[PDB]
């Protein structure tokens, strides 16, 4: 019925996500809370 | 070199992607730059030698 | 516009050149003898010769003790240090109370340092380092709207320059004495190299490249004690995020204080510094423990102790921390043997009226003369502070009905809306369930 | 924003007053206490004028007579941007901060600084991104086509903009906002292209936006103190901030005020249950009110001639006479049957509960008999009994069932007193067996 | 900072109300976006007579939140 998936902590981050010869990935995690 | 608007001579912030004419603000683009006659863009670009 | 909070009609003691108090001067009404004694104490502080002298001014509540202390602080001026304190602030959970008392003692001894500020700023036009892997020096050529200037620099400032990521065409800021380097941004002449960019663009400075200024630095001995006794270590100039380990207060030893005194005494003899002793003011002195009262006896016999001013409104009261010690003003007699006591007398009707008129003038309110006598009668019947605190609701209720003058109906309305302590107590006694 | 289920004061939207500071009989969720509402309106005008500082106002009365509700009405009528610190009396007894330091931090959180600054933003919809890169990535050439509904443009891209665009990966049809000076690019979502969803921006691409910041004095005190960073505003371990940094902040604020770069706004510090404070806290409050950077303090208590904490004598309202001499006292009164009925009607409309008229009369009778809060609490549990037998309107027998099930104080005291052998007394003596 | 946070000894700290307001704002935004659901629960305090007057006085305020 349903498949067990990865057990991960809930990421409280805002980062660069894709709204879809290599690919570039850069560390871009920030906090939603802004001062 | 500094960039200037081709229509008014003020500070040209933007540039149209079709005919490569620099303009100042939205009203110049809506009234002059976008509904412009063909062949006038080359005469505008003749002043700074970019035709 | 201006904020008035229970004071700031007091500008000084209102004395003449001979130390005789006028009746209405400096915002003070009455209280001749206490003002003259405070003037003598002000002259003694301005003498700058004695250490560890203590006075205490005692009286009833709402009688002018804190006003006299603030008048002393206004009389001395801003260059003399003045540390206000309440007696309950000595109980901290990080260090012992004696350490806090010694910290507040050394917070009231000041210093004056003559300094010179030298600043270069402008656009970078040339950045040519020279070696002999180790750079011997670097030549920087700055530029402003009034011309250019070429400077040599040691590699220590060059390391700070490459810390700031400074290239050709950036507007920088160099302090000559301290070696501080700040990058302001790229110049406006390079604003059209790209259509979209990450750099920020600033115009050229309109002044000269080289600027000089004379400044006077005021520090206290406690600041030097704090700066020499950081437990984790030093810190950078810019730290927006704090240290990973939290540094709390520590019991600073006597050896550090002796070394700080030696260094300051060496710097004074060259004419660099100037020593200005100050005033430590402790209000509500009856909230002190017997241990702090005992340590005050030792602290008042030092060679660097400032003038201490205490206030209390208690009568024959038991000392805190004891059980069966009854002494006047809540102060133990072994301490009482070391001070001079200044008595502060209460007020009668006309001075209460004059003080009410003064506070009405300061708060920019217009009161009719018919309402002023009723306000004075109210003040004599209940409290001076209750009459003083009722002026602003009276002004608001007068302004609500489009009037700029206080009418006695507003005073009756403000009396009906807001109660004093006695009427509230009479409500408390004649009630059934918890008021 | 501001998620909330239903509060005990959620029906109050502010003080019900006209332009002449007179209270309406029922307005903005407040019923009765006309003199208290008029006095609170006077205090609200005192705060809104902002020309005086350091005034103490005491609100005293019997329990469950509009004391905290008046403070909630004042805070709702104050509006945004003006600070309002609401603490309890027992919150200042910390383990890593002294009581005077906690009181100082509570005092300096109620004074704000208004700073207005203007920035430049580029907000629009991305049409096309063209990136040309080399084999080693030493140089990169970039073209970005962006638009609004009124203009179209193409930008020649630098190196750092290219690196800031491959990070936080943007594609065609996205709506993004770019700050030129800081290089921060925020993805606002996708446009209206089915092929979250955000309407395309209009007008000029490069707008000049002015924002008004309001920063409390305590934040500047934490930031200027170099021992801890700005994260101490969230972790809370500031740890006994010294006084010289506070003096520097006060002098710098007074310097900014003359040049027009900043404005002082004062707020209200509300201390609920002020009788729980110690005598040393009262002595600190006696001197904390005589400063220019001091807010207007509102205190609430229901004690009548109680023992002052930390002493051995009894004082009116649990407060010493030095603090009572510096304060003006607002007194609240008890309610009649019509005020109780109107308050119960408002609480019924707040909880979306339909009440019959006879149930309202029964609730008013049992409210004037025992307490207002008991009858307020009975409504939400009577509605569940109403829904259990599949009925919408609350009837009389549902209120009677809720009265039978859940007890009040006066019945429970009597039931304890008749059966005192079954409970533990003050001496720890109990009887558990039934027989003998 | 996040790397050094895993190595230090953890300790309870007085979390300020500003952080709680920010967390409430972010959670309200998540609920408004339609990806979150709020499940209130039950807090059970057995042997309530062991509490003293200060915790009771704070509980009086804490029950009146939303
Ligand atoms: N001689 C005076 N002239 C004008 N105002 C006075 C005079 N004496 C006292 N006051 C005012 O009366 C109030 C008394 O306050 P304070 O001296 O702090 O009380 P206490 O003496 O109990 O500490 C102050 O607000 C002060 O402005
Ligand atoms: N004038 C009023 N208008 C509306 N609700 C009121 C009024 N007076 C009291 N209440 C209600 O009564 C309850 C008790 O009020 P509150 O003042 O918080 O209790 P206490 O007096 O013990 O502080 C509150 O939930 C409030 O909603």
């Amino acid at each position: 019925f349903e498949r067990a998936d990865v057990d991960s902590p809930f990421s409280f981050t805002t980062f660069g996500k894709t709204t879809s010869k290599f690919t570039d990935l850069i560390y871009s995690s920030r906090n939603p809370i802004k001062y | 070199a500094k960039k200037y608007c081709d229509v008014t001579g003020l500070k040209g912030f933007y540039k149209s992607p079709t005919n490569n004419i620099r303009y100042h603000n939205a009203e110049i683009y809506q009234l002059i730059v976008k509904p412009m006659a063909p062949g006038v863009d080359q005469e505008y670009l003749k002043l700074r030698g970019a035709n | 516009v201006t904020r008035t909070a229970a004071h700031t009609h007091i500008k000084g003691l209102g004395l003449d050149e001979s130390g005789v108090a006028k009746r209405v001067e400096g915002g003070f009404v009455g209280q001749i003898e206490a003002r003259e004694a405070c003037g003598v104490i002000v002259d003694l502080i301005k003498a700058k010769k004695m250490s560890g002298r203590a006075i205490l001014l005692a009286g009833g509540p709402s009688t002018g003790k804190t006003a006299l202390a603030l008048a002393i602080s206004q009389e001395l001026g801003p260059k003399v240090p003045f540390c206000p304190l309440v007696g309950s602030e000595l109980y901290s959970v990080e260090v012992k109370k004696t350490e806090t008392l010694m910290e507040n003692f050394r917070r009231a001894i000041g210093l004056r340092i003559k300094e010179t500020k030298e600043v270069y700023e402008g656009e970078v036009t040339e950045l040519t380092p020279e070696d002999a892997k180790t750079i011997s020096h670097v030549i920087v050529g700055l530029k402003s709207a009034k011309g250019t200037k070429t400077l040599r620099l040691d590699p220590t400032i060059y390391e700070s320059i490459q810390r700031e990521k400074v290239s050709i065409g950036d507007v920088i800021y160099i302090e000559a004495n301290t070696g501080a380097v700040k990058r302001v941004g790229r110049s406006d002449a390079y604003a059209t190299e790209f259509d979209l960019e990450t750099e920020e663009y600033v115009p050229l400075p309109k002044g000269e490249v080289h600027k000089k200024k004379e400044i006077v630095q005021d520090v206290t001995l406690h600041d030097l004690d704090v700066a020499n006794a950081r437990p984790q270590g030093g810190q950078d100039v810019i730290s927006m995020m704090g240290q990973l380990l939290k540094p709390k207060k520590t019991e600073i030893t006597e050896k550090l204080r002796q070394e700080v005194n030696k260094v300051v005494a060496k710097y004074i003899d060259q004419g660099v510094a100037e020593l200005i002793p100050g005033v430590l003011f402790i209000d509500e002195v009856n909230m002190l423990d017997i241990e702090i009262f005992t340590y005050l006896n030792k602290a008042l016999e030092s060679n660097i102790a400032p003038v201490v001013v205490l206030a209390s409104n208690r009568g024959m009261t038991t000392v805190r921390g004891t059980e069966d010690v009854i002494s006047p003003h809540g102060v133990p007699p072994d301490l009482i043997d070391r001070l001079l006591i200044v008595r502060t007398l209460p007020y009668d009707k006309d001075e209460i009226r004059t003080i009410i008129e003064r506070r009405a003038t300061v708060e920019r309110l217009q009161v009719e003369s018919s309402a002023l006598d009723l306000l004075a009668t109210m003040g004599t019947e209940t409290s001076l502070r209750y009459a003083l605190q009722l002026l602003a609701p009276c002004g608001i209720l007068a302004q609500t009905s489009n009037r700029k003058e206080i009418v006695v109906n507003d005073v009756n309305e403000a009396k009906l809306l807001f109660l004093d302590a006695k009427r509230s107590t009479k409500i408390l006694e004649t009630s059934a369930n918890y008021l | 924003k501001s998620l909330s289920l239903i509060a005990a004061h959620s029906h109050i939207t502010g003080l019900g007053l006209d332009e002449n500071l007179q209270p309406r009989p029922t307005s903005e969720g407040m019923v009765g206490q006309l003199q208290a509402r008029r006095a609170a309106g006077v205090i609200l005008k005192m705060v809104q004028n902002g020309t005086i500082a350091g005034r103490a106002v005491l609100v005293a009365g019997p329990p469950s007579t509009g004391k905290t509700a008046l403070a909630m009405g004042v805070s709702q009528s104050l509006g945004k941007d003006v600070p309002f610190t609401a603490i309890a009396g027992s919150e200042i007894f910390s383990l890593e901060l002294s009581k005077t330091e906690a009181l100082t931090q509570a005092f300096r959180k109620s004074i704000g600084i208004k700073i207005k600054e203007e920035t430049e933003l580029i907000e629009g919809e991305v049409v096309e991104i063209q990136i040309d890169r080399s084999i080693t990535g030493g140089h990169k050439q970039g073209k970005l086509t962006i638009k609004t509904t009124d203009m179209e443009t193409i930008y020649e891209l630098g190196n750092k903009m290219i690196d800031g665009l491959t990070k936080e990966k943007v594609l065609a049809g996205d709506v993004i906002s770019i700050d030129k000076a800081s290089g921060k690019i925020t993805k606002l979502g996708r446009s209206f292209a089915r092929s979250r969803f955000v309407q395309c921006p209009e007008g000029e691409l490069q707008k000049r936006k002015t924002v008004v910041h309001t920063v409390s004095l305590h934040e500047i005190d934490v930031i200027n103190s170099r021992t801890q960073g700005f994260l101490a505003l969230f972790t809370g371990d500031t740890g006994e901030i010294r006084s010289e940094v506070r003096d520097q902040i006060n002098t710098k604020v007074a310097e900014w005020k003359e040049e027009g770069k900043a404005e002082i706004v004062p707020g209200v510090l509300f201390i609920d249950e002020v009788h729980m404070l110690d005598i040393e806290c009262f002595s600190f409050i006696n001197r904390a009110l005589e400063d220019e950077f001091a807010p207007i303090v509102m205190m609430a208590t229901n004690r009548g001639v109680s023992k002052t904490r930390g002493t051995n004598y009894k004082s009116p309202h649990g407060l010493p006479l030095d603090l009572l001499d510096r304060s003006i006292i607002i007194t609240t009164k008890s309610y009649n049957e019509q005020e109780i009925k109107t308050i119960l009607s408002i609480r019924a409309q707040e909880e979306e509960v339909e009440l019959s008229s006879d149930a309202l009369d029964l609730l008013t009778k049992t409210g004037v008999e025992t307490s207002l809060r008991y009858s307020s609490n009975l409504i939400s549990v009577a509605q569940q009994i109403a829904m259990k037998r599949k009925n919408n309107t609350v009837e009389v027998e549902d209120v009677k069932r809720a009265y039978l099930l859940f007890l009040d104080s006066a019945r429970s005291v009597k039931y304890v007193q008749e059966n005192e052998s079954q409970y533990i007394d003050d001496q720890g003596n109990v009887q558990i067996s039934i027989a003998k």
Side-chain angles (χ1 to χ4, degrees), chain D residues 8-9 11 29-32 62-69 335 343 372-373:
Chain D
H9 303 117
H11 65 278
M30 285 218 66
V31 177
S64 162
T65 48
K67 284 197 291 297
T68 323
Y335 295 131
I343 284 160
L372 178 68
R373 278 199 264 235

Side-chain angles (χ1 to χ4, degrees), chain C residues 6-7 9-10 27-31 60-67 313 347 355 384-385 388, chain D residues 290 326:
Chain C
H7 282 308
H9 60 280
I10 303 281
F28 257 104
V29 184
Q31 283 278 326
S62 152
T63 203
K65 312 192 277 293
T66 324
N313 46 16
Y347 305 115
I355 286 169
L384 171 71
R385 256 175 211 146
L388 285 182
Chain D
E290 329 204 9
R326 297 162 149 86

